[PDB]
Amino acid sequence: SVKAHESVMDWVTEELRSGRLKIGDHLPSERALSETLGVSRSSLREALRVLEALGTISTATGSGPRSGTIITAAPGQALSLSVTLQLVTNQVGHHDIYETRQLLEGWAALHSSAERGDWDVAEALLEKMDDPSLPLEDFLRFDAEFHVVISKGAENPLISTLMEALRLSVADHTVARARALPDWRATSARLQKEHRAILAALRAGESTVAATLIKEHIEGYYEETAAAEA
């Protein structure tokens, strides 16, 4: 219930604040927590089931004696589901998603610091993406992941969380745009070349160059799929 939900949020918040608990730690059993909060065991399980679906909480099987309910504090898919659902209606269009990426990625690139980038993780993603047999959908899923990873160079975790939360809707968007592409082989090749030149600029600390390349990369794909007609 609401009472249970808020009681839990306030409780977890205070545990994290005091240091008694840390992200990744297991919560007390439902029996114990429900008594501590003064709420029915039923309303507590429901509140936790919802928090689990949202990503705030996560469950690990086989944890006994530990509860198996972990404080993860992940944004979940709510934001992506809202973006993608709105996209179906006249309320939101592909260009709106495209432009959102430009705003966020542009800011991250502009403020990127070479010593802060998880460059090896990003380059590995690009490694899997060169696989000639790799399906169009998987390639674009890694593509969106790659863009989230390189945005970490700006070391702004909130911006990074927003990027991660939008990841699913970004892939949904590029995948749909790709449907009308005449030659995915050639397109993915150019995208890969651009991805590496972007990563190189970021590695060299050429923030302004990286930002320009990212802008041209995202816009290039958007215009290309528009021409293909989709």
Judged by the rule CB under 8 A, the positions of this chain that interact with a copy of itself are: 5, 9, 12-13, 16-17, 22-23, 46, 49-51, 53-56, 71, 73-79, 81-86, 88-89, 91-93, 96-97, 99-100, 103-104, 107, 156-159, 161-162, 165
Interface with Zn ion, residue 172, by CB under 5 A: no
* Residue in the structure block whose two tokens are 């702004």: 156
- Among 134, 230, 143, which residue's Cα sits nearest to residue 181? 230
Interface with Zn ion, residue 105, by CB under 5 A: no
Closest contact distance (angstroms) between CB of 43 and a copy of itself is 12
Structure tokens at 81: 């589901």
DSSP assignments along 74-121, one per residue: ---SHHHHHHHHHHHSTT--HHHHHHHHHHHHHHHHHT--GGG--HHH
Q: Which stretch binds Zn ion (CB under 5 A): 82-90, 118-126, 140-148, 149-157?
A: 140-148
Closest contact distance (angstroms) between CB of 219 and a copy of itself is 15
CA distance 77 to 68: 21
User: Which residues make up each annotated binding site for Zn(2+)?
Assistant: 143, 147, 195, 217
Site for Zn ion, rule CB under 5 A = 143
